[PDB]
Design a binder for this molecule. Structure first.
Ligand SMILES: [K+]
Ligand SMILES: [K+]
Ligand SMILES: [K+]
Ligand SMILES: [K+]
Ligand SMILES: [Mg+2]
Ligand SMILES: [Mg+2]
Ligand SMILES: [Mg+2]
Ligand SMILES: [Mg+2]
Ligand SMILES: [Mg+2]
Ligand SMILES: [Mg+2]
Ligand SMILES: [Mg+2]
Ligand SMILES: [Mg+2]
Ligand SMILES: [Mg+2]
Ligand SMILES: [Mg+2]
Ligand SMILES: [Mg+2]
Ligand SMILES: [Mg+2]
Ligand SMILES: [Mg+2]
Ligand SMILES: [Mg+2]
Ligand SMILES: [Mg+2]
Ligand SMILES: [Mg+2]
Ligand SMILES: [Zn+2]
Lengths: 154, 166, 236, 46, 110
RNA sequence: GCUAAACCUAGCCCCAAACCCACUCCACCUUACUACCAGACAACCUUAGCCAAACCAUUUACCCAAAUAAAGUAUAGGCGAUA
RNA sequence: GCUACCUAAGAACAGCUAAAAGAGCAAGAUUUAUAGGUAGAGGCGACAAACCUA
RNA sequence: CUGAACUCCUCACACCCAAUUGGACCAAUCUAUCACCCUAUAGAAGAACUAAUGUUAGUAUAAGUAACAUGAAAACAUUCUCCUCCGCAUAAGCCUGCGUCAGAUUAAAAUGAACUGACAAUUAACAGCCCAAUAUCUACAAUCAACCAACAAGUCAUUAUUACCCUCACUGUCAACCCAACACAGGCAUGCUCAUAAGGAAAGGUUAAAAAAAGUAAAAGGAACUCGGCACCUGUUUACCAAAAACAUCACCUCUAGCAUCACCAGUAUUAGAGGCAGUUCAGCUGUCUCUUACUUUUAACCAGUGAAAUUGACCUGCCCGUGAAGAGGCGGGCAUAACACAGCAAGACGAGACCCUAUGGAGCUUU
């Protein structure tokens, strides 16, 4: 029974799980786009979002610096977090990362995901795009919406 | 060993008379000594039976099994061969007439057991056979209807004879 | 790798030192690779139906060499002889009479004639000869290895032929079974003058650029565009 | 606790115990060589 | 427990060929609009993704040369500039990565 | 349709007839196949048990110069087996 | 070349009470490398009738 | 009236008893002579296989099951996380066994490669490999060797005369390595490092069922309920907290022996050898238990790769009662019943799994 068990069991145990996520998070901050097994990227995505929130507290904040020190193994990333990533998202209240499933990797056919920090310099990922408004179904719904405006106005 | 499948493409038919309906082209292709078990390969060969060449390629492309890539290459080779050497017009106008796996020539290796017993492990190989036929996929036979069932049952009653008498 | 250089480059990269072989025996060739002096068919020849003297003189020099090996040779008889060889060779295609075909055509011609039709059915017939065939050119090679001297005679043939090629399944893929069509062909004939058993055999055909495009094929064809890797971008 | 490791290789022991000179040292050992010669053994002794 | 009897081929076919054992046909396959290759509806196109990764790898190799060592992550934003392009006013005061290539059509300067 | 199947030689057996073998160079009884130092060690001596006696306790066989016959006879033997 | 015993010539052993040196906790009737010896009617055995390359 | 292989009827008629015997026939093979799309008459013989706890080969079943494997990201440069149980060297063993190039071969892995082909390599100072004769010499341990001590009494040495003028050969030198076991199960001498400057990776991916293994935490109680919790000297042995017994052995006792050039012993009755030697309770703590619960890891299940074995007469493999039946999936009566995966379970089938007497057989050992 695993009712309400939010966290996955990974690696060699609890401590190993955090270190596995920390290594993935450290790679994401440096590269801004990494690809790994889907479950691990999904497990790490929450920490990636929360790390940006600590970066918004500022480097002067002692608790935030302690968080960045632990979660960022490579210390040169800590300045990047507070001075690059955090200011980038100053306006946004969330949704810092986007996660997309990519084809299963050849060796073990593991389900794979790509996760990136929105706004990176890297070439854009081929995001899924909703159908054009000009399509037949959308045009029929656009006409319906316009009529409901006239009826509402009356 | 036997290699009859390769020779089937060498059959030459007499020129058809104008009245005769155009005979659909048939392409036979296979890959020998694949490093895979025929048992595992059978499911992949079964899956694409009766599919169009494009539908079979699509299903195999997103199949995780190792055999799927091998069969997909054989299918692409057969499709290219059909148009180039067998005078098939449209490459898409092909369907999987026959798709089967066959036991290859296997290698026996000395293996070991946890208590020191001596064992023979076989390194399994298999063959994949495909036959492509020109034209659209034959429609799947529909389900037997209630009307068909009733007709069959009444036919059985009508075929009854007085048994063991003059 | 198919090329020999790549094979020997792979062999030196594999340490497979292949020593060469010297023997008294060598491959015995009954024909040559190509035409000794290509005969450019004058443009407009089909339309009709000092340089000429110089070219004719070369044929007169060559015809003497042919007479030396075989004295009882008449260039006047060859057009009729060549016509018969041409018709017999093509008739062998109808019934895949390869052993007979080998006597009528050289080892250079044989692959071209029969390779493509290995699994096809060919129906060919010589309906008529529109104008008499005449020997346009006569050439003769210089002394080659093994003392082999070859003589090549080019004959211009304007004839009416019928060709229908069926595929491996009996379905018509080219031509019409009975409709006669007009064909102008320049056919080079070769003979090993040194060989005591050499005979005049069809060697090759000459295709001038002005030649009209051949009959269109029945089926449609798709010429695929560049198959590009993900990084490579298509460029018009 | 170890099993099947009776062999503790020693070249000095192997030559002294089963060597050519040892076999010739006694008449029984010489007959050992003679039997192997008769059988056509590739190795008459260590 | 050892098997009591050999299982017949008849029985084994029923087990091995049961629908539960057969590969299911996939209905979520589609054609990618950009490249025309096949993809699943919920998965990124393999052909298009590899194209992005190839260019991303070249850019990362260029970033490595500029950094010229480990633990040298910059404290400013990065901008990629292709041949024939000049730094924008917005893209000023940022690390500039120069690619000896024309900007890909899919990669749009912002 | 696969896996496979199929094959005719390599040689071998039993006789006959004839009495066989073996030092290119170099190395080889020491830890053999190891160029080159006072040796000393020297071989010879009933085959046994046992096939069987339904056990076993004396007891039976494996060679000595011509096929055949004398003859399974004379003879030996818990006078039994058997020889 | 296992093992038992033996021969030759070797080797190893922290701290702690520490008089006494002792399987005290953790220097001995200890452990251990090398070569050699004892052979089945036998050998060897702080003797289990054990072991002597199953 | 029904109801046999009895009897009749039409036809046929030598055609249902083990061993055994008698008389015919006969597959294939070889030989003589025929024959000549596969035969005949004879002669001969390695002459016929559903009955094997038989041999060899092929392929099944179990089973695509059990089981096996690669720390993370990335620019593949590098960095990060964790482990260290080691590591380096010598000896011994081993003998080219992850160097280059190539490969169609190989590991889960179509870079790697320890497999294949070719090419290359370990260089002596270290180490091994030693020495003229004849006589003669060699009482005093080691232990920081000094002081104080001992007992089991000890690895360390010459001279005389004669002889001798010559020189640096030969061999070992590589490796991810040996003996094993086939989940390191394990074994392995010495020096140095004493926690590493050297050497390494527990997780193929996922899910987070049971059962199982290990670990951690646990209300109240604190061994309750359970075969049994936890806290005449010396030496080996099975067992281990151990107890016990056995053997050994100091001491003790009797027994035999008056002597030397292979043991006893280079000893001599104060010697030598052979024998015998007759702690509970209590208090305290604990998932042992009342009475189990939670979590982590492994296993597990699913995906992908690779891929065993025991077993198997055949199988279209139900329940109840009856039948010797508590000997029935298969027989009698009755009942039940469309087909077919996967995960569990362990009632049955089915399997993994001492004692008896008998045979005109042995072997130790004990003697009446
Ligand atoms: K080795
Ligand atoms: K709990
Ligand atoms: K019953
Ligand atoms: K059971
Ligand atoms: Mg009767
Ligand atoms: Mg027989
Ligand atoms: Mg099973
Ligand atoms: Mg498993
Ligand atoms: Mg593991
Ligand atoms: Mg030296
Ligand atoms: Mg070395
Ligand atoms: Mg290290
Ligand atoms: Mg691992
Ligand atoms: Mg896991
Ligand atoms: Mg796993
Ligand atoms: Mg408690
Ligand atoms: Mg009690
Ligand atoms: Mg108590
Ligand atoms: Mg319990
Ligand atoms: Mg699997
Ligand atoms: Zn695409």
């Amino acid at each position: 029974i695993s009712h309400g068990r939010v966290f996955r069991r990974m690696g060699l145990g609890p401590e190993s799980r955090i270190h596995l996520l920390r290594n993935l998070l450290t790679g994401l901050v440096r590269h801004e786009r990494i690809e790994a097994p889907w479950a691990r990227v999904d497990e790490m995505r929450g920490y990636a979002e929360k790390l940006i929130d600590y970066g918004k507290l500022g480097d002067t904040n002692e608790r935030a610096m302690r968080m960045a020190d632990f979660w960022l193994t490579e210390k040169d990333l800590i300045p990047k977090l507070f001075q690059v990533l955090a200011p980038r998202y100053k306006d946004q209240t969330g949704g810092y990362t986007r996660m997309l499933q990519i084809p299963n990797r050849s060796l073990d056919r593991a389900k794979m995901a790509v996760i990136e920090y929105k706004g990176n310099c890297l070439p854009p990922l081929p995001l899924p795009r909703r159908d054009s408004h000009l399509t037949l179904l959308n045009q029929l719904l656009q006409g319906l919406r316009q009529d409901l405006r006239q009826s509402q106005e009356a | 060993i036997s290699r009859k499948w390769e020779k089937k493409n060498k059959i030459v038919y007499p020129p058809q008379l104008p009245g005769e309906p155009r005979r659909p082209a048939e392409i036979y292709h296979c890959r020998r000594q694949i490093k895979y078990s025929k048992d595992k390969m059978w499911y992949l060969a079964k899956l694409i039976r009766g599919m169009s060449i494009d539908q079979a390629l699509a299903q195999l492309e997103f199949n995780d099994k190792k055999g799927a890539k091998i069969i997909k290459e054989v299918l692409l080779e057969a499709q290219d061969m059909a148009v180039r050497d067998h005078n098939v017009e449209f490459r898409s106008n092909l369907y999987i007439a026959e798709s089967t796996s066959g036991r290859g020539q296997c290698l026996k290796r000395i293996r070991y057991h946890g208590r020191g017993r001596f064992g023979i492990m076989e390194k399994v190989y298999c063959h994949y056979f495909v036959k492509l036929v020109e034209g659209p996929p034959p429609p799947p036979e529909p389900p037997k209807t209630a009307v068909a069932h009733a007709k069959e049952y009444i036919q059985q009653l009508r075929s009854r004879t007085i048994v063991h008498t003059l | 790798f198919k090329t020999e250089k790549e094979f020997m480059q792979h062999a030196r990269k594999a340490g497979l030192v292949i020593p060469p072989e010297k023997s008294d025996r060598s491959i015995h060739l009954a024909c040559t690779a190509g035409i000794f002096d290509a005969y450019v068919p004058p443009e407009g020849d089909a339309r009709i139906s000092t340089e000429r003297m110089k070219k004719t003189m070369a044929s007169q020099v060559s015809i003497r060499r042919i007479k030396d090996y075989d004295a009882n040779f008449k260039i006047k008889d060859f057009p009729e002889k060549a016509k018969d060889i041409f018709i017999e060779a093509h008739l062998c295609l109808n019934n895949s009479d390869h052993d007979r075909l080998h006597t009528l055509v050289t080892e250079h011609c044989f692959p071209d004639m029969t390779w493509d039709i290995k699994y096809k059915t060919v129906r060919w017939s010589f309906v008529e000869s529109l104008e008499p065939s005449h020997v346009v050119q006569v050439r003769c090679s210089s002394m080659m290895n093994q003392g082999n001297v070859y003589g090549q005679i080019t004959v211009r043939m304007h004839t009416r032929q019928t060709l229908a090629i069926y595929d491996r399944f009996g379905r018509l893929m080219y031509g019409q079974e009975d409709v006669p069509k007009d064909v102008l062909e320049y056919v080079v004939f070769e003979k090993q003058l040194t060989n005591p058993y050499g005979s005049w055999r069809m060697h090759t055909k000459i295709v001038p650029p002005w030649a009209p495009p051949k009959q269109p094929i029945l089926k449609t064809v798709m010429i695929p565009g560049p198959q590009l890797k993900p990084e490579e971008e298509y460029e018009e | 606790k170890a099993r099947g490791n009776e062999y503790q290789p020693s070249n000095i022991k192997r030559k002294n115990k089963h060597g050519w000179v040892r076999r010739l040292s006694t008449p029984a050992g010489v007959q050992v060589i003679l039997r192997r010669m008769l059988k056509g053994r590739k190795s008459l002794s260590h | 427990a050892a098997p009591k009897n050999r299982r017949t081929i008849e029985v084994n076919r029923c087990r091995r060929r049961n629908p539960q054992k057969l590969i299911k046909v996939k209905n979520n396959i589609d054609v990618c609009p950009e490249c025309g290759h096949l993809k699943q509806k919920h998965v990124l196109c393999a052909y298009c993704y590899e194209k992005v990764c190839k260019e991303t790898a070249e850019i990362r190799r260029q970033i490595g040369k500029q950094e010229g060592g480990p633990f040298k992550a910059p404290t400013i934003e990065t901008v990629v500039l292709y041949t024939g392009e000049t730094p924008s006013e917005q893209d000023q005061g940022k690390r500039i990565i120069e690619r000896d290539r024309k900007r890909p059509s899919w990669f749009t300067q912002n």
